[PDB]
Amino acid sequence: SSTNVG
Amino acid sequence: SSTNVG
Amino acid sequence: SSTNVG
Amino acid sequence: SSTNVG
Amino acid sequence: SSTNVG
Amino acid sequence: SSTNVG
Question: How far apart are CA C2 and CA F6, in angstroms?
Answer without folding.
Answer: 17
